[PDB]
Design a protein around this ligand. Structure first.
Ligand SMILES: [Mg+2]
Ligand SMILES: [Mg+2]
Ligand SMILES: [Mg+2]
Ligand SMILES: [Mg+2]
Ligand SMILES: [Mg+2]
Ligand SMILES: [Mg+2]
Ligand SMILES: [Mg+2]
Ligand SMILES: [Mg+2]
Ligand SMILES: [Mg+2]
Ligand SMILES: [Mg+2]
Ligand SMILES: [Mg+2]
Ligand SMILES: [Mg+2]
Ligand SMILES: [Mg+2]
Ligand SMILES: [Mg+2]
Ligand SMILES: [Mg+2]
Ligand SMILES: [Mg+2]
Ligand SMILES: [Mg+2]
Ligand SMILES: [Mg+2]
Ligand SMILES: [Mg+2]
Ligand SMILES: [Mg+2]
Ligand SMILES: [Mg+2]
Ligand SMILES: [Mg+2]
Ligand SMILES: [Mg+2]
Ligand SMILES: [Mg+2]
Ligand SMILES: [Mg+2]
Ligand SMILES: [Mg+2]
Ligand SMILES: [Mg+2]
Ligand SMILES: [Mg+2]
Ligand SMILES: [Mg+2]
Ligand SMILES: [Mg+2]
Ligand SMILES: [Mg+2]
Ligand SMILES: [Mg+2]
Ligand SMILES: [Mg+2]
Ligand SMILES: [Mg+2]
Ligand SMILES: [Mg+2]
Ligand SMILES: [Mg+2]
Ligand SMILES: [Mg+2]
Ligand SMILES: [Mg+2]
Ligand SMILES: [Mg+2]
Ligand SMILES: [Mg+2]
Ligand SMILES: [Mg+2]
Ligand SMILES: [Mg+2]
Ligand SMILES: [Mg+2]
Ligand SMILES: [Mg+2]
Ligand SMILES: [Mg+2]
Ligand SMILES: [Mg+2]
Ligand SMILES: [Mg+2]
Ligand SMILES: [Mg+2]
Ligand SMILES: [Mg+2]
Ligand SMILES: [Mg+2]
Ligand SMILES: [Mg+2]
Ligand SMILES: [Mg+2]
Ligand SMILES: [Mg+2]
Ligand SMILES: [Mg+2]
Ligand SMILES: [Mg+2]
Ligand SMILES: [Mg+2]
Ligand SMILES: [Mg+2]
Ligand SMILES: [Mg+2]
Ligand SMILES: [Mg+2]
Ligand SMILES: [Mg+2]
Ligand SMILES: [Mg+2]
Ligand SMILES: [Mg+2]
Ligand SMILES: [Mg+2]
Ligand SMILES: [Mg+2]
Ligand SMILES: [Mg+2]
Ligand SMILES: [Mg+2]
Ligand SMILES: [Mg+2]
Ligand SMILES: [Mg+2]
Ligand SMILES: [Mg+2]
Ligand SMILES: [Mg+2]
Ligand SMILES: [Mg+2]
Ligand SMILES: [Mg+2]
Ligand SMILES: [Mg+2]
Ligand SMILES: [Mg+2]
Ligand SMILES: [Mg+2]
Ligand SMILES: [Mg+2]
Ligand SMILES: [Mg+2]
Ligand SMILES: [Mg+2]
Ligand SMILES: [Mg+2]
Ligand SMILES: [Mg+2]
Ligand SMILES: [Mg+2]
Ligand SMILES: [Mg+2]
Ligand SMILES: [Mg+2]
Ligand SMILES: [Mg+2]
Ligand SMILES: [Mg+2]
Ligand SMILES: [Mg+2]
Ligand SMILES: [Mg+2]
Ligand SMILES: [Mg+2]
Ligand SMILES: [Mg+2]
Ligand SMILES: [Mg+2]
Ligand SMILES: [Mg+2]
Ligand SMILES: [Mg+2]
Ligand SMILES: [Mg+2]
Ligand SMILES: [Mg+2]
Ligand SMILES: [Mg+2]
Ligand SMILES: [Mg+2]
Ligand SMILES: [Mg+2]
Ligand SMILES: [Zn+2]
Lengths: 211, 58, 159, 105
RNA sequence: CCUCGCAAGAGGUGCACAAUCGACCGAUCCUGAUGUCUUCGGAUGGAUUUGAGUAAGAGCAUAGCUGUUGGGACCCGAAAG
RNA sequence: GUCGAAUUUGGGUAUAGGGGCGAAAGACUAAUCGAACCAUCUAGUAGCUGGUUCCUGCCGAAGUUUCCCUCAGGAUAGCAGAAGCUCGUAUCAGUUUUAUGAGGUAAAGCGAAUGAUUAGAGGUUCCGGGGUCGAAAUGACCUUGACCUAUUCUCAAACUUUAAAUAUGUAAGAAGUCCUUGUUACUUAAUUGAACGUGGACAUUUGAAUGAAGAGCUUUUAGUGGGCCAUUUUUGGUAAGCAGAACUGGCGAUGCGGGAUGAACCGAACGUAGAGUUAAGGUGCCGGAAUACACGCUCAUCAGACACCACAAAAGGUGUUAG
RNA sequence: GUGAUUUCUGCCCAGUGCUCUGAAUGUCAAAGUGAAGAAAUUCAACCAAGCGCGGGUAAACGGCGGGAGUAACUAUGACU
RNA sequence: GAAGACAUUGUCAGGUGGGGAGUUUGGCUGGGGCGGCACAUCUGUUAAACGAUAACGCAGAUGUCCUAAGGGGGGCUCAUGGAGAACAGAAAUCUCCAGUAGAACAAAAGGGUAAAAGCCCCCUUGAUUUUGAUUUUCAGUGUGAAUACAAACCAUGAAAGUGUGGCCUAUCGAUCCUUUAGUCCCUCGGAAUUUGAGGCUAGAGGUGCCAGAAAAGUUACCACAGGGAUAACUGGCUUGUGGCAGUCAAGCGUUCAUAGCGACAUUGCUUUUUGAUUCUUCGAUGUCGGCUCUUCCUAUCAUACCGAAGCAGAAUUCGGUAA
RNA sequence: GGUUGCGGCCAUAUCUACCAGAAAGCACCGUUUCCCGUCCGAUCAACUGUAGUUAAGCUGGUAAGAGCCUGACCGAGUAGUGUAGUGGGUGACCAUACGCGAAACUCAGGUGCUGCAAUCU
């Protein structure tokens, strides 16, 4: 009873969120956006490869989840379930309606049907971090999730360290200096702004200008 | 038997044939809406200076 | 069905200017208005009495009358193919003096100056305003400044 | 609603022409009286044949009425009228709204 | 149109019309003098009221086109009563 | 079918139209019956259908507003014609510039409020629950939740600090500006003010641009009150040559060149003609006009061939081309 | 109204009809009566049939239930 | 002989009276009907940053409620959270701290509001009198609602002030008739007095189809004027649904992704499905099925020749050229 | 320059933490006969200026402070947008032509100005 994904492919309607005014909507077929070793430290996984959309279109949750499987499945069984962090970067917040079915076209406002993510051109769908030696495994990983989606998307080697905001040399310059300290799966950065007091408490290994 | 509900189509073409005529200025507009207390006294003020300029021709 | 009430559609229009809520500052009531002043109309949601209708929001008019708490304004509102004269009764909170004439009042007493200070000198005035003219010729030097040659850059990605 | 049985308000009675105290009561009806020209003219149209000769109203919408207070100047005798907004329950008795009380039993 | 000026201009008077403030008559409301068959009389001066009014008349009549209403009503047409 | 009877049948006679007659079918009552036939009221009414008769000249629409037992119709405003009338460099403008306002859409934002959403990290419990120690503890230790703190991925027609473009109000002088100092019953402590004035000073570089086959004004009346299409914005619908809005431009009411063909596309709007030049579109032949010039690409056992437009997708190729 | 014969035509009068030696103090027209009033008129009491109250009636019009449980497997349910 | 002032008859009055007469038996609407109310209104959004703006668009609301929940003055500060106090526990009352409003202000929503517009108290009736102007809706009609003055009479506060109902945006009603208030006024036309009646000004009794008729069915016995403005059949656009065909390859197939199959996804084709639409036809294009006969399509069931096989043979399955 | 009374603008004035403040002022502060108000002279009212104090308020300074304000060819001529074509693409979309042009970000600078009257080493 799922209408072919051809029917909702394009972005024809204003965003229709689940809201106080919507309320009846089903649940997203894709509920988990972080797979593999997502506790991993920022230094562990320098190599970042994105799945990037070349279209302005809509991705169903059922196609999202189905691709998330295919990609995370290929990666674990070849490089191992700890070798990568797959981050689904796109959340299906927008509700597709359907006019189910006696009168025909009178009063035709539909009821929630599925969910989709509204996707830009150049907008990232999947993001993966590993170490450079794992590249060709990652890439074939996303390349098969490609087949799960409508519309052209292209894989892209990031100029960035993992999921950080910095290019690999600029992360190195900052990290071999004091400015970077670990967190969570992410990092924090020493700011030259604010109270000097606990700016030094945190980041003790700065304030040398040496190793 | 449904039919077109409404449109403003063609309506500014019609408006522009003969019109959008500018507001029509006048020296000496009306006192319409003006405060009675003001206007009652003003009635006398003018009658005063009118009586003045009469005794200015004598 | 449809809903057309007096304040309909005015959600953000009568809203208060972020972190500007509360009392109206006291200058608003010290300002003094006379018949003939041009005023701008901006309704203040905090004062519900004497409020202009939303159509006159952002509209300039001429005060025709002055009362205890209020000034009457006349506005030319155009209905159909003509204009009609609407007169509005507004609390002073909704009305500010218009700057629309100040460049004219500046320019009159300025054009009066360079008129006297010229004629008493023997004429040569030119006090009408002229538009932006095309600029004249000029000679740009190369001294300390040699052209820096630029070319189109190639395609990169960086994401 | 609930309104008082007394009202201090403007009396126009020309010997007072000032604020006095009014006894407040609810206006009612008044009797038919044939010989009102309307009933007299209607009674004639109705004799003979032809059936009902005038419309007879059916499609009733309002579930309420507008209450009309009869104000009475206790001094100068002249009575005035005032008409309240539409209301479903009207007592001009008493038992005012009361303070902070606690619901009973 | 009149006066001045060679002319440009300036002043004088300004019908029709238009804008504006007033005055007059009736209505409404207020005021209520002199007097009186002590209840008649209603001067006088007023008022965000009001009239299809006054303020040196513009009509009446015949005729024409166009338009209006009633009429068989531009022509032919019900089922019925 | 029935054929000796509730049989067939002639003639005479009775019953008449909201009436008759009916072994009952709304049957029959003179080819007429869910109310016969004849004349008259009667040219009944018809918001409905059809038609409405000579030529040329000029101007030239509407399918929209409001009200209607209104939705196939009227009234009302609008658009249209006509008649003009008072004036005239005058005043006028579907335009720009300058000055000064108004706005919360687009984008943007979420380590800003509200609301949603992925992930961890670090804290806080006499206190949500579980478990070991236990007589217990306002006990200690794991623990999982909730919260708090600094971070992190992602969103909003009915969220938002900020915030456009286009569109929009007002102003750009003689109805202006300055001086002197009158009137009043309003107003002031007050000849204070407010309003309206008398008298005086400065002309067209008199106060931005461009245009102006002038501007202003009055009366009366037609048709219309089914609209439809295209680019852009845009709602409902999987969609529709589908339904509904916004601004403009069209078609309708309109031929002409082009798109073979075609209401709406492109070009361009029509008095009768001559010469020239073009538009959109074309120039192998049909067919007016280079089987022109130039560099590449393409070989298809269903090649391809020009907008609107008369469809094709994912996904593939050790065909060939260039990266 | 039902439709030869044969056989049998059960329960229901609350409803709508029909109908009655019924009840009585409910309601109820014109006239007539009484009261007030200058009179027009107003108010009152009385009051026919009828309605209401009551009784009869289905070969009058017509109607003729729903939920649980329950018997030495299950099932079923005479029974509740 | 019978009957007898009773019957009868006449005039009014009540009952009864589809036996008969006359009439009526809303609108919008993706045909009409059922339904809903988009029929009079309010908030937010759709609405494209002035204004306007449509659908049986989206989320809601209105026919009320209040002598205070109206008016004025004074005082006070709210939601929550933290830390404390006998019974007392998650929740009782008491205290301090923090607290931009996270509360409350009848109700829908959106504005608005902090020595308030919220909470407690004190005093009250301006929710009053007169008659104009103005804003929204608009025709610049009416109604509703609202604004700012004028003229009273009042409230409250030391006062400035404020107050013409409810913080703002909804909460409602012609002509005729009846009824009441008002001045004590005009008229009853031969003249008075008194009842009665009629006028004038202002309210109430209501029209919700909300610019405002007094209104049940049935027709298959049916009628007329029309409509392709409008349904049922062909055909047209659409292709959700139906049907057929791919791509990725997790799985199935003893082992083995693809011999034969194939999930999660996803791209398509088709017009013997059914829907959606309402363009053509309502001054008529003869419905279902069968019989008969022709011709065409191919997504091939058989027959011809082939390639695969989890093809030993036999049988079968998948595929190709094939109508 | 300080302070006070009344202010205008209404965070460059607010917030958090500390330090400093002479003279005057303000304040805290003392009393409850009186007018007045409270459960409570805490608030409020009156009386004292006597008997005390800079502790608080108040003023100012400090902080790679939070916030807020201002600026910049920081981002970015980016996003978006008015106009154009028989422009590209099956489409979704996109490029170009003549114009207009943000927000975040990044960086630097800043932390009340000021009117009237009185008063003060
Ligand atoms: Mg619905
Ligand atoms: Mg793909
Ligand atoms: Mg219709
Ligand atoms: Mg249509
Ligand atoms: Mg129409
Ligand atoms: Mg609405
Ligand atoms: Mg409207
Ligand atoms: Mg109010
Ligand atoms: Mg009477
Ligand atoms: Mg009477
Ligand atoms: Mg009286
Ligand atoms: Mg009232
Ligand atoms: Mg006939
Ligand atoms: Mg008839
Ligand atoms: Mg007959
Ligand atoms: Mg007859
Ligand atoms: Mg007869
Ligand atoms: Mg015949
Ligand atoms: Mg016959
Ligand atoms: Mg005829
Ligand atoms: Mg005829
Ligand atoms: Mg009609
Ligand atoms: Mg022409
Ligand atoms: Mg009507
Ligand atoms: Mg027609
Ligand atoms: Mg908006
Ligand atoms: Mg928004
Ligand atoms: Mg947006
Ligand atoms: Mg932003
Ligand atoms: Mg947020
Ligand atoms: Mg939250
Ligand atoms: Mg625990
Ligand atoms: Mg402009
Ligand atoms: Mg010119
Ligand atoms: Mg000319
Ligand atoms: Mg007309
Ligand atoms: Mg018309
Ligand atoms: Mg119409
Ligand atoms: Mg066009
Ligand atoms: Mg036509
Ligand atoms: Mg045309
Ligand atoms: Mg044309
Ligand atoms: Mg073609
Ligand atoms: Mg053509
Ligand atoms: Mg073009
Ligand atoms: Mg040929
Ligand atoms: Mg040739
Ligand atoms: Mg091409
Ligand atoms: Mg193309
Ligand atoms: Mg290739
Ligand atoms: Mg029989
Ligand atoms: Mg018998
Ligand atoms: Mg029986
Ligand atoms: Mg029994
Ligand atoms: Mg019975
Ligand atoms: Mg009976
Ligand atoms: Mg009687
Ligand atoms: Mg029964
Ligand atoms: Mg007798
Ligand atoms: Mg009958
Ligand atoms: Mg009948
Ligand atoms: Mg209908
Ligand atoms: Mg219905
Ligand atoms: Mg209403
Ligand atoms: Mg809008
Ligand atoms: Mg708007
Ligand atoms: Mg609906
Ligand atoms: Mg608490
Ligand atoms: Mg309307
Ligand atoms: Mg209303
Ligand atoms: Mg209140
Ligand atoms: Mg009376
Ligand atoms: Mg007489
Ligand atoms: Mg009398
Ligand atoms: Mg009398
Ligand atoms: Mg009535
Ligand atoms: Mg109606
Ligand atoms: Mg209506
Ligand atoms: Mg009938
Ligand atoms: Mg029959
Ligand atoms: Mg049709
Ligand atoms: Mg399909
Ligand atoms: Mg399908
Ligand atoms: Mg195998
Ligand atoms: Mg296996
Ligand atoms: Mg396997
Ligand atoms: Mg037909
Ligand atoms: Mg035909
Ligand atoms: Mg035929
Ligand atoms: Mg045929
Ligand atoms: Mg094998
Ligand atoms: Mg000291
Ligand atoms: Mg200190
Ligand atoms: Mg202080
Ligand atoms: Mg700072
Ligand atoms: Mg294009
Ligand atoms: Mg672009
Ligand atoms: Zn009195």
């Amino acid at each position: 009873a799922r209408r072919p994904a051809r029917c909702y492919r394009y972005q024809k309607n204003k965003p229709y969120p689940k809201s106080r005014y919507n309320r009846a909507v089903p649940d997203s077929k894709i509920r988990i956006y972080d797979l593999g070793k997502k506790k991993a430290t920022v230094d562990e996984f320098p190599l970042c490869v994105h799945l990037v959309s070349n279209e302005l279109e809509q991705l169903s949750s059922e196609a999202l989840e189905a691709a998330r499987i295919c990609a995370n499945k290929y990666m674990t069984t070849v490089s191992g379930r700890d070798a990568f962090h797959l981050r689904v970067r796109v959340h299906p917040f927008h509700v597709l309606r359907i006019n189910k079915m006696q009168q025909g076209m009178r009063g035709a406002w539909g009821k929630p049907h599925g969910l989709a993510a509204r996707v830009d051109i150049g907008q990232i769908i999947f993001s993966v971090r590993t170490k450079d030696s794992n590249k060709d495994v990652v890439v074939e990983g996303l390349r098969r999730a490609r087949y799960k989606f409508p519309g052209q998307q292209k894989i892209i080697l990031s100029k960035k360290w993992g999921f950080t905001n910095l290019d690999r040399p600029e992360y190195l310059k900052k990290r071999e200096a004091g400015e970077v300290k670990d967190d969570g799966a992410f990092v924090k950065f020493l700011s030259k702004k604010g109270s000097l007091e606990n700016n030094i408490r945190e980041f003790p290994e700065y304030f040398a200008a040496q190793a | 038997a449904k039919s077109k509900n409404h449109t403003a189509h063609n309506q500014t073409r019609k408006a522009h044939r003969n019109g959008i005529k500018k507001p029509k200025t006048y020296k000496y507009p009306s006192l319409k809406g003006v405060d009675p207390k003001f206007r009652r006294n003003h009635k006398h003020a003018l009658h005063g200076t009118a009586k003045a300029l009469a005794a200015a021709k004598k | 069905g449809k809903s057309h009430g007096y304040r309909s559609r005015t959600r953000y229009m009568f809203q208060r200017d972020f972190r500007k809520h509360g009392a109206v500052h006291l200058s608003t009531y010290l300002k003094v208005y006379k018949v003939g002043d041009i005023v701008d109309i901006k309704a203040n949601g905090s004062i519900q009495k004497g409020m202009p209708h939303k159509f006159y929001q952002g509209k300039t008019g001429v005060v025709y009358n002055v009362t205890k708490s209020s000034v009457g304004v006349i506005i030319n509102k155009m209905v159909g193919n003509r204009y009609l004269e609407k007169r509005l009764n507004l609390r002073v909170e909704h009305i500010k003096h218009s700057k629309c004439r100040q460049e004219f009042l500046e320019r009159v007493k300025a054009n009066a100056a360079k008129r006297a200070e010229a004629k008493a000198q023997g004429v040569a005035v030119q006090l009408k305003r002229q538009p932006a003219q095309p600029r004249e010729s000029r000679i740009v030097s190369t001294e300390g400044n040699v052209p820096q040659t630029l070319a189109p850059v190639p395609y990169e990605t960086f994401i | 609603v609930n309104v008082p049985k007394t009202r201090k308000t403007y009396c126009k009675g020309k010997t007072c022409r000032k604020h006095t105290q009014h006894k407040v009561t609810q206006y009612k009806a008044g009797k038919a009286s044939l010989f009102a020209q309307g009933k007299r003219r209607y009674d004639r149209k109705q004799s003979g044949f032809g059936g009902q000769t005038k419309p007879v109203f059916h499609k009733k919408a309002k579930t309420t009425k507008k209450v009309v207070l009869r104000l009475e100047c206790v001094k100068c005798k002249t009575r005035a009228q005032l008409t309240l907004k539409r209301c479903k329950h009207f007592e001009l008795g008493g038992e005012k709204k009361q303070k902070g009380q606690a619901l009973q039993f």
